[PDB]
Design a protein around this ligand. Structure first.
Ligand SMILES: CC(C)CC(=O)Nc1cccc(-c2cccc(CN)c2)c1
Length: 228
């Protein structure tokens, strides 16, 4: 998260760190007792690494009573996701067991009704991704409020050039932005999960290249079907 602030410890009890070989790789969101939603691009290149999900965390390194590391039983990428596109970039991770629910570990309800978030609406984005242009990685969870950008402006030639489908939304990226290591984490509007961070492009914090988020409501039938 560029241009954000440290979050309040455990105020986002849905927040998950998706880990490869003991290190934070991607954000994720606890959406049911046994399932975490993240981005499909995260698991390309996992190949024989230890894939785990850290729940109940604030600091990645320091000990905390609520922190617990879970193994993944099953990972289900959306079947139309591909490494060279930004489309359908969702991943569902089934934990080895039901997560232990508590003040610091709780699922976040997600939008099932396919309606665009209105432009200008401020949405909360959180993660352990990099926090500046010198590559600094934070120890503790960061967050930022970003205004939703309307799809037609997002789709102009100077911005993302028709790439933003009805299944994607954008937010302003002017010095405040999701960045490397925030992928798969939550965009929350009205207290509900509306988006999952994705990227087509390496650039962060450039007004001309808005952040892109996969609209979970757009995949509501697929999500339900995998959760059953
Ligand atoms: C960590 C893997 C999923 C590989 C990957 O995609 N890396 C990578 C590198 C630089 C910027 C970003 C990136 C992420 C989230 C948002 C944005 C821009 N808003 C950029 C992403």
């Amino acid at each position: 998260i560029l241009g954000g602030r440290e979050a309040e410890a455990h105020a986002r009890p849905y927040m998950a760190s998706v880990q490869l070989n003991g290190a934070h790789l991607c954000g994720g969101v606890l959406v049911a007792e046994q399932w975490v939603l993240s981005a499909a691009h995260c698991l390309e290149d996992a190949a024989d690494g230890k894939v785990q999900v850290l729940l109940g965390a604030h600091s990645l390194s320091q000990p905390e009573p609520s922190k617990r590391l879970y193994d993944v039983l099953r990972a289900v990428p959306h079947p139309d996701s591909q490494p060279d596109t930004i489309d359908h970039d969702l991943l569902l991770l089934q934990l080895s067991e039901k997560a232990t629910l508590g003040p610091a570990v709780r699922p976040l309800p997600w939008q099932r009704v396919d309606r665009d978030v209105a432009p200008g609406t401020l949405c909360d984005v959180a993660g352990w991704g990099i926090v500046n242009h010198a590559g600094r990685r934070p120890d503790s969870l960061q967050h930022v409020l970003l205004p939703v950008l309307d799809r037609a402006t997002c789709n102009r030639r100077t911005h993302h050039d028709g790439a933003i489908t009805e299944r994607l939304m954008c937010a302003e990226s002017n010095r405040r932005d999701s960045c490397k290591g925030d992928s798969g984490g939550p965009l929350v509007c009205g207290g509900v999960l509306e988006g999952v961070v994705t990227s087509g492009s390496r650039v962060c914090g450039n007004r001309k290249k808005p952040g892109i988020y996969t609209r979970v409501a757009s995949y509501a039938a697929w999500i339900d079907s995998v959760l059953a």
